[PDB]
């Protein structure tokens, strides 16, 4: 890769990993797969970040949110419970750990596993509590792709945290566990459960 | 494989007809694909469907219902709304039907339905989402069945000589209990 | 499973008692000849993409 010696030299592993066109140390974004057309432009992450830690100012525009990294997005949605608030280093390291697990879970591409989880866990159609006159029936709506991805990452992180509470397992292992039971939906994950139930009561109410 | 429905045009309603005609026949012939001939001598509109026009059975009927709706002195917009929606129908009463009224008694009665500057009729429609025509002794209503029922109710209450206020009460009562649902 | 693909082409406004669900006109993706009237629970823009299950269901107005 043609190495370059400075006075204080960059460690060789860094140079090697990043001049081999690898976007992390053990992963690459050039291998990422989206199934639906609705998720393609709302999950899109094609800029290689080594830390998944961006000073994103995407909270100023509503659609601009969809151009912020999805691994950084799931990273900041790890930080949900009130005791872990204001700690992004924890969530980033935990996501890096999760990715260290999905690799040693016989899965060659952890990023495509996560993206397929996001694709599988976003509810197509939902319900709304429309009036109808006192006894409010539920109208079957069709939730947006943006809120599909939102609800996806939500159900994932929440299911995984709800599982990793009061059991010895670390958060990264139930987050990999959730993301893999949801990568290819198995009805053993929280997110696929809730998605299927939302679409079921959306179906029953039309 | 044709079909011919022929509807007579009243004299009074004819002039606005040949006034807005150019806005009238295109949504029929173009949006619904239909043949709209007009005999200005025998005062008749002729709606034909032919094989070269696509297969939609109730389309022609809906055409003739547009035409008759405008015939009854209704507006263009409401009749096009008739083309679009199915749930919209047309009621008709005589005043002599509900209460035998003679001379001025009839006259005043009509006013109680209209009100000063239409204000009372207005009120009934907006709270019943409908279109009313106050002809001579005939009153026409245009809208959903569940709606025109209510409209008929309040308008009858008027024709019975009940005071407008009471009818406002019943009106906002009904409009509330239905817009709620 | 029947996954229908939708394309939000025209924004009609906001309905519902709470005022949150967006009324939307949809251009069907797979068969571009179908144009559906759909309700969305979420933030939508123009030329968006939805995923419906019953393309033959329409929605007039919401309370």
Swiss-Prot record, chain A:
Q: What is its main location?
A: cytoplasm
Cross-link (Glycyl lysine isopeptide (Lys-Gly) (interchain with G-Cter in ubiquitin)), chain numbering: 26, 184
Q: Tell me which UniProt keywords the record has, alphabetically.
A: Acetylation, Cytoplasm, Isopeptide bond, Phosphoprotein, Ribonucleoprotein, Ribosomal protein, Ubl conjugation
Q: Name one Pfam family in it.
A: Ribosomal_S7
* A single GO BP: cytoplasmic translation
Please state where this protein is localized.
Cytoplasm
- What is the purpose of this protein? Component of the ribosome, a large ribonucleoprotein complex responsible for the synthesis of proteins in the cell. The small ribosomal subunit (SSU) binds messenger RNAs (mRNAs) and translates the encoded message by selecting cognate aminoacyl-transfer RNA (tRNA) molecules. The large subunit (LSU) contains the ribosomal catalytic site termed the peptidyl transferase center (PTC), which catalyzes the formation of peptide bonds, thereby polymerizing the amino acids delivered by tRNAs into a polypeptide chain.
- Record's family? Belongs to the universal ribosomal protein uS7 family.
- Can you say what this protein is called? Small ribosomal subunit protein uS7
Organism expressing this protein natively: Saccharomyces cerevisiae (strain ATCC 204508 / S288c) (Baker's yeast)
| Gene name in the database record | RPS5
Curated annotation (Swiss-Prot), chain B:
Residue ranges of every copy of the KH domain listed in the record: 103-155
Phosphoprotein keyword on record: yes
Keywords, A to Z, come to:
Cytoplasm, Nucleus, Phosphoprotein, Ribosome biogenesis, RNA-binding
| UniProt key word Hydrolase | no
Which BP terms from GO are recorded? Answer: endonucleolytic cleavage in ITS1 to separate SSU-rRNA from 5.8S rRNA and LSU-rRNA from tricistronic rRNA transcript (SSU-rRNA, 5.8S rRNA, LSU-rRNA); endonucleolytic cleavage to generate mature 5'-end of SSU-rRNA from (SSU-rRNA, 5.8S rRNA, LSU-rRNA); proteasome assembly; ribosomal small subunit export from nucleus; ribosome assembly
Report the outcome of residue 143 to D.
Answer: Accumulation of aberrant 22S and 23S rRNA intermediates
Q: Which residues form a coiled coil?
A: none
Q: Where in the cell is it found?
A: Cytoplasm; Nucleus, Nucleolus
Q: Name one GO molecular function term.
A: rRNA primary transcript binding
- The principal location of this protein is cytoplasm
Of the GO CC terms on this record, one is: cytoplasm
Q: Where exactly are the transmembrane stretches of this chain?
A: none
Similarity-based family: Belongs to the PNO1 family.
Instruction: Provide the function of this protein.
Output: Required for small ribosomal subunit (SSU) synthesis. Has a role in the processing of early nucleolar and late cytoplasmic pre-RNA species. Recruits DIM1 to nucleolar pre-RNAs. Indirectly required for cleavage at the A2 site of the 20S pre-rRNA, forming 18S rRNA, and at A1 and A2 sites of other pre-rRNAs.
Subunit and interaction comment:
Component of the small ribosomal subunit, ribosomal RNA processing complex (SSU RRP complex). Interacts with NOB1.
How is this protein named in the record? Pre-rRNA-processing protein PNO1
Q: Which source organism does the UniProt entry give?
A: Saccharomyces cerevisiae (strain ATCC 204508 / S288c) (Baker's yeast)
Q: Which gene encodes it?
A: PNO1
Curated annotation (Swiss-Prot), chain C:
Quote a single Gene Ontology cellular component term.
cytosol
GO molecular function per UniProt? structural constituent of ribosome
Q: Does the keyword Acetylation apply?
A: yes
> Which terms are listed as keywords in the entry?
Acetylation, Cytoplasm, Ribonucleoprotein, Ribosomal protein
Q: Which PROSITE patterns match?
A: RIBOSOMAL_S28E
Where in or outside the cell?
A: Cytoplasm
Q: Name one Pfam family in it.
A: Ribosomal_S28e
Q: How is it modified after translation?
A: N-terminally acetylated by acetyltransferase NatB.
**CDD domains noted in UniProt:** S1_S28E
InterPro entries named in the record: NA-bd_OB-fold (IPR012340), Ribosomal_eS28 (IPR000289), Ribosomal_eS28_CS (IPR028626)
Picking any one GO biological process from the record gives: positive regulation of nuclear-transcribed mRNA catabolic process, deadenylation-dependent decay
Parts of the chain that traverse the membrane: none
In UniProt terms, what function does this protein have? Component of the ribosome, a large ribonucleoprotein complex responsible for the synthesis of proteins in the cell. The small ribosomal subunit (SSU) binds messenger RNAs (mRNAs) and translates the encoded message by selecting cognate aminoacyl-transfer RNA (tRNA) molecules. The large subunit (LSU) contains the ribosomal catalytic site termed the peptidyl transferase center (PTC), which catalyzes the formation of peptide bonds, thereby polymerizing the amino acids delivered by tRNAs into a polypeptide chain.
Family designation: Belongs to the eukaryotic ribosomal protein eS28 family.
Q: How does it assemble?
A: Component of the small ribosomal subunit (SSU). Mature yeast ribosomes consist of a small (40S) and a large (60S) subunit. The 40S small subunit contains 1 molecule of ribosomal RNA (18S rRNA) and 33 different proteins (encoded by 57 genes). The large 60S subunit contains 3 rRNA molecules (25S, 5.8S and 5S rRNA) and 46 different proteins (encoded by 81 genes).
Tell me more from the record. Answer: Present with 94500 molecules/cell in log phase SD medium.
Protein's UniProt name: Small ribosomal subunit protein eS28A
Q: Which organism is it from?
A: Saccharomyces cerevisiae (strain ATCC 204508 / S288c)
User: In the UniProt record, what gene is named as encoding this protein?
Assistant: RPS28A
């Amino acid at each position: 890769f043609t190495p370059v010696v400075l006075a204080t030299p960059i460690p060789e592993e860094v140079q090697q990993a990043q001049t081999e066109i690898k976007l992390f140390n053990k992963w690459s974004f050039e291998e990422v797969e989206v199934k639906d057309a609705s998720l393609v432009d709302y999950v899109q992450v094609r800029q290689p970040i080594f830390v998944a830690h961006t000073a994103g100012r995407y909270a100023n525009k509503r659609f601009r949110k969809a151009q912020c990294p999805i691994i950084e997005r799931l990273t900041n949605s790890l930080m949900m419970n009130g005791r872990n608030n204001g700690k992004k280093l924890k969530a980033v390291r935990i996501i890096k750990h999760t990715l260290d697990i999905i690799n040693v879970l016989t899965d060659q591409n952890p990023i495509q596993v996560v993206v397929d989880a996001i694709t599988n866990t976003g509810p197509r159609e939902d319900t709304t509590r429309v009036g109808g006159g006192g006894a409010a029936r539920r109208q079957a709506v069709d939730v947006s792709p943006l809120r599909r991805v939102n609800q996806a990452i939500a159900l994932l992180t929440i299911g995984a945290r709800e599982a990793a509470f009061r059991n010895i397992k670390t958060i990264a292992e139930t987050l990999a566990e959730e993301l893999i039971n949801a990568a290819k939906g198995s009805s053993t994950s929280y997110a696929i459960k809730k998605k299927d139930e939302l679409e079921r009561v959306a179906k029953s109410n039309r | 494989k044709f079909e011919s429905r022929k509807i007579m045009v009243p004299p009074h309603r004819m002039t606005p007809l040949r006034n807005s005609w150019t806005k009238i026949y295109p949504p029929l012939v173009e949006h619904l694909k239909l043949q709209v001939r007009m005999n200005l001598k025998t005062k008749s509109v002729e709606l034909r469907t032919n094989p070269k026009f696509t297969t939609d059975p109730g389309a022609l009927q809906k055409g003739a219902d547009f035409i008759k709706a405008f015939t009854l002195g209704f507006d263009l917009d409401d009749s096009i709304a008739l083309l679009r929606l199915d749930d919209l129908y047309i009621e008709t009463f005589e005043v002599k039907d509900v209460k035998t009224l003679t001379g001025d008694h009839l006259s005043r009665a009509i006013g109680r339905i209209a009100g000063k500057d239409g204000k009372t009729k207005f009120a009934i429609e907006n709270a019943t989402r409908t279109r009313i025509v106050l002809a001579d002794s005939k009153i026409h209503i245009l809208g959903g069945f569940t709606h025109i029922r209510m409209a008929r109710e309040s308008v009858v209450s008027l024709i019975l000589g009940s005071p407008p206020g009471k009818v406002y009460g019943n009106l906002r009562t009904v409009a509330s209990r239905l817009k709620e649902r | 499973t029947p996954v229908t693909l939708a394309k939000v082409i025209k924004v009609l406004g906001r309905t519902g008692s709470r005022g949150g669900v967006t009324q939307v006109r949809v251009e069907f993706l797979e068969d571009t000849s179908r144009t559906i009237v759909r309700n969305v629970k979420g933030p939508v823009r123009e030329n968006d993409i939805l995923v419906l299950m019953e393309s033959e269901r329409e929605a007039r107005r919401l309370r």
